[PDB]
Design a protein around this ligand. Structure first.
Ligand SMILES: [Zn+2]
Ligand SMILES: [Zn+2]
Ligand SMILES: [Zn+2]
Ligand SMILES: [Zn+2]
Ligand SMILES: [Zn+2]
Length: 329
């Protein structure tokens, strides 16, 4: 009904039991993600570079090989930058494009532009090659479950899944209102002015975004994710509960509840990131960015060598469980 944009306010998860939690933990592979999804992305890939094209092709190819009915769209646009007009390309991967509601996971796939120093190149391992690879691994690990979302004569889902890989999150020169968030600013405005579902008189694609889960700066040891917003606080609590359950079942590695990732801790300030253009239009956001930022932030040391594989593996399991429970799969 025309209250369908309010359904997100009443939506509850379908909780997984212990057996299912073990199955999900066993179904993801950090080493396969590392070799097949993460390492091809550990390249210079600022917007418009050859590496940006190679990264986009890799992301699309890894989604395209899956059995689930992903619809891939490239959102290419022109923007002014400190280096003049440039082209950018957001990547969107949607299951059930005409379903009214989607849970949305997102990160940025560009890497910040820097000069090279003594044969060193910035590859943004935490920022955000690892979030990209986590999203690809979730699509792979959950592929057989997500296949059941596919629209047939028997069933068409109200609620499905979408992935967004933003281009141009980073400033080209100096972080500023004109030099930042190129892809997310563009895509939020575009979705805000696109009727959804097709044929709708008065609702946009933005109204169908149940929840935007934004991964950024993930892969360093001991991350702490604050609970940022009152309208996603209850979903933050579900992340806490999932971390705690997986912990008690012995399904996490190198993990203590004293140093857990999702603490009883909120953050009143603003973190400027790709969620802001969505947040400012009323989309609920779960912002999975650590506070403080990793010490390697925007340095040449944000590389593969300094990633913490167990932390990523643990967060893969938590995120996959969260997504299945949200979608009732
Ligand atoms: Zn566009
Ligand atoms: Zn370069
Ligand atoms: Zn960054
Ligand atoms: Zn306990
Ligand atoms: Zn261990």
């Amino acid at each position: 009904g025309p209250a369908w944009p309010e359904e997100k306010n009443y939506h509850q998860p379908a909780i997984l039991n212990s057996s299912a939690l073990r199955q999900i933990a066993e179904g993801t592979s950090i080493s396969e993600m590392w070799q097949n999804d993460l390492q091809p992305l550990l390249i210079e890939r600022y917007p418009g570079s050859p590496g940006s094209y190679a990264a986009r092709q890799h992301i699309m190819q890894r989604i395209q090989r899956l059995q689930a009915d992903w619809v891939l769209e490239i959102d290419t646009f022109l923007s002014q930058t400190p280096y003049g007009y440039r082209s950018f390309s957001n990547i969107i991967s949607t299951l059930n494009p005409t379903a009214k509601r989607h849970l949305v996971l997102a990160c940025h796939y560009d890497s910040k532009y820097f000069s090279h120093w003594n044969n060193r190149v910035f590859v943004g391992a935490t920022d955000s090659a690892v979030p990209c690879a986590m999203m690809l691994e979730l699509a792979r690990a959950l592929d057989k479950k997500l296949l059941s979302l596919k629209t047939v004569s028997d069933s068409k889902p109200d609620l499905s899944l979408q992935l967004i890989f933003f281009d141009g999150e980073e400033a080209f020169l100096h972080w500023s209102p004109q030099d930042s968030l190129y892809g997310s600013r563009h895509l939020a405005a575009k979705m805000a002015s696109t009727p959804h579902p097709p044929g709708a008189r008065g609702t946009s694609q933005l109204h169908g975004m149940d929840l935007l889960v934004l991964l950024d700066l993930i892969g360093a040891p001991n991350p702490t994710f604050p609970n940022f917003f009152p309208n996603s606080a209850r979903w933050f609590e579900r992340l806490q509960a999932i971390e705690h359950e997986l912990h008690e079942l012995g399904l996490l590695k190198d993990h203590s509840l004293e140093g857990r990732y999702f603490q009883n801790y909120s953050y009143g300030g603003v973190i400027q990131d790709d969620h802001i253009p969505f947040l400012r239009r009323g989309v609920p956001v779960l912002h999975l960015i650590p506070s403080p930022f990793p010490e390697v932030w925007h340095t040449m040391d944000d590389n593969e060598e300094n990633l913490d594989e167990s932390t990523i593996d643990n967060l893969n399991k938590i995120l996959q469980v969260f997504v299945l429970e949200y979608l009732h799969l």
